Amino acid sequence: IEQPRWASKDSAAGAASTPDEKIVLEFMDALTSNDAAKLIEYFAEDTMFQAMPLPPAYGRDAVEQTLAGLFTVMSIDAVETFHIGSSNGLVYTERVDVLRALPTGKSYNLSILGVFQLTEGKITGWRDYFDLREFEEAVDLPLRG
C-alpha cells in the first residue's frame, strides 16, 4: 500500500504511542484473519460496532455476528494504517483496507477513517467512516439495496 500524497511526514504519525494505540494496531493486523471469533476477544461486553453506511450493532453478540456476516462475502486482505492518534479514550485511525469480494474476486483499496473507544484495554466502540458506493461499484458487490 502506497503512502498517499496528503500523508503526514511526521515519522511517528503512523506509530502507536500509548498502550491503547498499540492494541488498536494489533487489532488492525488481526483484521486480516476474517475471523469474527478471533476479533471478538478485543471487545468488551458493553460495546458497539458500525460501518457507518450500514446499520449499527450494539452488544458483543451483535458485533460478532455483524462482523461474521461481512466476512461471509468479503475478505480483508491487508490494512495499512497511515495515521494513528488518540485523546480521552478514543483512538483514531486513517487507513486503507484492501477488501476483496468473494463472489466476484475483485479487490479495492478503500480509504477509511475510524474511531475506537477503549476502556480497560477492551473495545467498547468501533466506527469506520468511508464511502460504501465506491466499494460496491469497484468490486461489483452491493451491500446496501
Next chain:
Amino acid sequence: HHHHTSKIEQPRWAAGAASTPDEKIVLEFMDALTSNDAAKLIEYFAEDTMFQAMPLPPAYGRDAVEQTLAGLFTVMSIDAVETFHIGSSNGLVYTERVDVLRALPTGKSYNLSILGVFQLTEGKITGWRDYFDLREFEEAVDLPLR
C-alpha cells in the same frame, strides 16, 4: 447550534471540547463553516495545503481548495455542525461530528455523519479530509454530487 429549524439527535454511542491549541483552532473552523464563505474560510489554510471530501477528488494548494469549497457552497449550505468527539496526536486533529447539510437546488436537508482529520502546521490547516458516505446524502436531498 443557533439554527432552530435544525435538530441533531444525540447518538447512542456518544469529550467534544478542545484540549490543545490545535483543537481549539479546528473547533473555531467548525463554527466558521456555517458562514458558507470560501473567501473567509480560506484564511484558516496554509499555502501548502489540501482538502478532500473523500468521496470526491482532492484539491491541492490554497487556490484549488478555495475554488473547491466555493463550488460546494453554490449548491449546499452547512446549517450546523456538532462535534461529539475531538482528539489530536502528531499534529493531526480528529473530529467525530454531524453536519446538517441543506441542498440549495432542492431545499432538502440531511444530517451527515462525518469523521474528519485536520493536519495543522503553526496554527494553519495543511490538510482537511472528511470521511462520510456520499450516496445516503445524495438520496436524502435529491442532489447527485459526483
